């Protein structure tokens, strides 16, 4: 959907035997902070013996892109469920922010592999600092020197209410 990145911090409820428990922090992509907390309890239930009934939320914040006007390449590590078994992949994207890559990845996996949102786990997102660490060949072509290309056969835009044109259109925009 339309996402944005959060950080959320949780804690086991303090007790007389264990005052000052440990603190855990995650980065979660979610449409809003109501479901940002819900995903935190889901991921934490698979790593530590903590529930929502016996825990509490310390802080939730919003992380914004540092340079949302610079183009950069990203790489994503993820796991998902197929119709039989689980698998690991690693894909790449080219855009300006961290948030849109997760948006692009979710739409990409839904089309090529029929994978829904229910069955995708995000492991790590890292911005590729150099240019020789780009692996996939559909991004290597977009970083070639002196890139330029034309746009042949592009349909002109005509109002959808204007029927019965009086002359033949042209496709040389």
């Amino acid at each position: 959907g339309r996402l944005q990145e959060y950080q959320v911090i949780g804690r086991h409820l303090p007790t007389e035997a264990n005052p000052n428990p440990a603190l855990y922090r995650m980065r979660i992509f979610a449409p809003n902070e109501v479901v940002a907390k819900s995903r935190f309890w889901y991921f934490l239930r698979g790593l530590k013996k903590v529930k929502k009934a016996t825990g509490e939320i310390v802080s939730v914040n919003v992380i914004s892109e540092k340079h949302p006007l610079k183009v950069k390449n990203f790489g994503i590590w993820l796991r998902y469920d197929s119709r039989s078994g689980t698998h690991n992949m690693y894909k790449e994207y080219r855009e300006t922010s961290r948030v849109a890559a997760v948006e692009a990845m979710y739409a990409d996996m839904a089309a090529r592999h029929r994978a829904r949102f229910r069955s995708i786990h995000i492991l790590k997102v890292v911005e590729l600092e150099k240019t020789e660490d780009v692996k996939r060949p559909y991004i290597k072509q977009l970083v070639a020197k002196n890139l330029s290309f034309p746009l042949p056969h592009r349909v002109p835009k005509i109002s959808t209410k204007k029927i019965f044109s009086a002359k033949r259109p042209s496709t040389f925009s």
């Binding site: 060949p137 559909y138 072509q141 890139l147 290309f149 034309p150 042949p152 056969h153």
Partner: protein, 191 residues
């Protein structure tokens, strides 16, 4: 995965002229003229240098790019045919019954006609008419040869295949009955 730029080039020798208009190619040289229509393929033609023709495809798929090399060699074949021609040879293969042919001359039109008699001792006289621009000759170099020559590879080759496909044995083991006429060599008229 769509490829941004795929390009090929065709050199042109300093003997002939070529003109392209609305994806219709006309090649004219010392030995004649040929035309081909390529309106079914989306290709962009251009003049790279003083004697080099370039062609390319933008934002094409894997299937679309495949046709790019097919177009290049077809046009190159046209250039070769108008300056060097083509030449095919055929041989007669029989065990007992000799095969007799009669390449009669032009039949009031440019077409040649070939008559084949006494195939495996049959009473059919079977007749095939060649495409225009193709001339059929009986060789004098050695025995049992048919020589086909012309300007266009497509017409010469298809007509040669017409002769081979007409001499067929039916209801017999074809590993034993090797009777027929077969093509044996392909080349140009010059050199």
């Amino acid at each position: 995965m769509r490829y941004i730029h795929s390009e090929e080039t065709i050199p042109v020798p300093e003997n002939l002229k070529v003109s392209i208009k609305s994806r219709l190619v006309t090649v004219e040289g010392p030995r004649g003229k040929l035309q081909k229509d390529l309106s079914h393929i989306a290709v962009n033609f251009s003049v790279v240098k003083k004697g080099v023709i370039g062609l390319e495809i933008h934002h094409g798929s894997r299937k679309d790019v495949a046709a790019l090399r097919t177009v290049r060699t077809i046009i190159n074949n046209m250039i070769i045919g108008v300056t060097k021609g083509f030449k095919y040879k055929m041989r007669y293969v029989y065990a007992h019954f000799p095969i007799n042919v009669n390449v009669e001359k032009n039949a009031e039109t440019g077409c040649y006609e070939v008559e084949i008699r006494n195939f495996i001792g049959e009473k059919i006289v079977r007749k095939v008419v060649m495409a225009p621009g193709v001339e059929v000759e009986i060789s004098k170099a050695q025995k049992d040869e048919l020589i086909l020559s012309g300007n266009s590879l497509e017409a010469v080759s298809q007509s040669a295949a017409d002769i081979q496909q007409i001499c067929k044995v039916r209801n017999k083991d074809i590993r034993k009955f090797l009777d027929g006429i077969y093509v044996s060599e392909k080349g140009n008229i010059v050199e």
